[PDB]
Design a protein around this ligand. Structure first.
Ligand code: WKR
Length: 134
């Protein structure tokens, strides 16, 4: 057993708060905000050796990242930014930093009770997204 055992599985979005304001702060345009904000993604997390894979499947986009903790990778996000990302484990929380165009956003994922809670921060603006097991 390991690092991210408690994250592994298939998860479904059940609530979102402040996501439009987070996307505004990130610089997402109107049409993408409206459509992306409607999405109810499933998130599929798996581990194979040192490689973690996170898939998001939704009506908007299907995305997948695979990474090793601490090791930077390039990501094209669901809203089409070209970012450089590094994901680490800090006290049991997966911390995902995305950098582009001199900007940065941090996405934290943690297990709380039977949920997976995702907190997305851009400057002073936070969005909280809660997932339950599918
Ligand atoms: C910002 C958006 C929704 C316009 S674009 C986008 N693309 C990818 S791939 N991932 C995300 C993402 C990942 C984790 C938490 C919140 C968002 N967003």
């Amino acid at each position: 057993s390991h690092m991210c055992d408690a994250f592994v599985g298939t998860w479904k979005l059940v609530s979102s708060e402040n996501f439009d304001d987070y996307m505004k702060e990130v610089g997402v345009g109107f049409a993408t905000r409206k459509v992306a904000g409607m999405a109810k993604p499933n998130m599929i997390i798996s581990v194979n050796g040192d490689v973690i894979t996170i898939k998001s499947e939704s009506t908007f986009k299907n995305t997948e990242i695979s990474f090793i903790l601490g090791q930077e990778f390039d990501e094209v996000t669901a809203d089409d930014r070209k970012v450089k990302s590094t994901i680490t484990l800090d006290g049991g929380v997966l911390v995902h930093v995305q950098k582009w165009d001199g900007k940065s956003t941090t996405i934290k994922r943690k297990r709380e009770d039977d949920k997976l809670v995702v907190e997305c921060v851009m400057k002073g603006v936070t969005s909280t997204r809660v997932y339950e097991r599918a």
